[PDB]
Design an enzyme around this catalytic site. Structure first.
Site, PDB file in Angstrom:
ATOM      1  N   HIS A  29      18.249  13.657  33.559  1.00  0.00           N
ATOM      2  CA  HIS A  29      17.276  13.923  32.207  1.00  0.00           C
ATOM      3  C   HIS A  29      15.850  14.117  33.054  1.00  0.00           C
ATOM      4  O   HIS A  29      15.378  13.407  33.847  1.00  0.00           O
ATOM      5  CB  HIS A  29      17.174  12.792  31.257  1.00  0.00           C
ATOM      6  N   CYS A  42      19.230  21.892  31.765  1.00  0.00           N
ATOM      7  CA  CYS A  42      18.555  21.336  33.304  1.00  0.00           C
ATOM      8  C   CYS A  42      17.112  20.899  33.036  1.00  0.00           C
ATOM      9  O   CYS A  42      16.773  20.120  31.983  1.00  0.00           O
ATOM     10  CB  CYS A  42      18.859  22.525  34.053  1.00  0.00           C
TER      11      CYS A  42
END
Ligand SMILES: [Zn+2]
Length: 325
Positions: free
Chosen positions: A275, A15
């Site tokens: 991203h 994450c």
């Protein structure tokens, strides 16, 4: 290699951990606390809410590596292992795990939180902050914790329930294109509670579609601002200042200080193929850099504001290390 200009390898997904670590790494009071070894005397080894110091110690070793100037990038693997044991948004968990691993309180007392009872806001807020400090007293509280006011009005019995509550960052709702001030203003605007999130009125013991209004009471040295893009993603362009964010018009505490802030870091999210990356200002040369996992590159202020901006770190001008306002 210049200390702090150190990337983080991608272990695999994780994450926005690297992005968050880069914002925290470029939070000067936090990094200075660890590089000066002030954390050893404050490690809490017997906290039922903590990791017996293991999150603080793995974070400290990581920070020391990143600011040694020996590495172009490092792997945050041990720290990730400890964070994953603490927690099966990640930022709340990171700050909470560091906080409890460094909590100066050894045994948290049970505290009864009184409703305002028509007492003045100042009295109620100072009581709330004292109670908080009776259970939570650490470098994390010192750098990141502020206090906000919540007013709930019952639609049925007209009870007015006022509470003051700590925060370690502000989640802002998004008002196309908007300014940061517009989002804060919306954050403080009185809404009616939906049937998806009612409020338990203690006077008649029913869930209610109460009005809720938030107000800012006190702001921390480092103000972390989370733009609520998830719950698909809102790609709104939020324009925010690099320098001289003046929060004074939003505070209801008349004894708050100047409360001017300068941006120090930005967590970005792209294409959520999601991203995360970071912009951060380096504390030694004052320049901006772009951190993309192991890659570090120079940046300029004029690319910081983008639709990708997701979490903003601001530092209060009167708390800057080495300069006095
Ligand atoms: Zn009621």
């Amino acid at each position: 290699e210049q200390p702090g200009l150190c990337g983080l390898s991608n272990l695999g997904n994780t994450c926005f951990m690297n992005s968050a670590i880069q914002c925290l790494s470029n939070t000067p009071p936090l990094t200075e606390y660890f590089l000066n070894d002030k954390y050893q005397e404050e490690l809490n080894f017997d906290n039922p809410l903590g990791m017996r110091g293991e999150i603080a110690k793995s974070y400290a070793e990581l920070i020391k590596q990143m600011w040694s100037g020996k590495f172009s990038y490092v792997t945050p693997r041990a720290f990730k292992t400890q964070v994953g044991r603490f927690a099966p948004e990640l930022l709340a968990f990171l700050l909470d795990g560091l906080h409890e691993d460094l909590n100066r309180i050894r045994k948290k007392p049970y505290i009864q939180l009184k409703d305002a009872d028509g007492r003045p806001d100042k009295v109620v807020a100072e009581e709330a902050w004292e109670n908080h400090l009776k259970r939570n007293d650490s470098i994390i509280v010192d750098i990141f914790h502020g206090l906000f006011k919540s007013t709930l009005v019952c639609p049925e019995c007209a009870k007015i329930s006022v509470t003051f509550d700590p925060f370690c960052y502000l989640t802002l709702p998004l008002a196309s294109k908007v300014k940061l001030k517009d989002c804060i203003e919306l954050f403080t605007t009185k809404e009616k509670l939906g049937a998806e999130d009612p409020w338990y009125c203690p006077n008649c013991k029913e869930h209610q579609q109460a009005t809720k209004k938030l107000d800012l009471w006190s702001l921390p040295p480092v103000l972390v601002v989370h733009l609520k893009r998830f719950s698909d993603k809102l790609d709104t362009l939020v324009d925010f200042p690099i320098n001289d964010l003046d929060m004074s018009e939003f505070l209801i505490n008349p004894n708050a200080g100047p409360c001017r802030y300068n941006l120090i870091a930005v967590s970005n999210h792209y294409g959520g193929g999601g991203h995360y990356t970071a912009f951060a200002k380096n504390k030694d040369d004052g320049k901006w850099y772009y951190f993309d996992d192991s890659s570090v590159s120079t940046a300029s202020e004029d690319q910081i504001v983008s639709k990708a901006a997701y979490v903003l770190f601001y530092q209060r001008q009167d708390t800057f290390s080495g300069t006095g306002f």
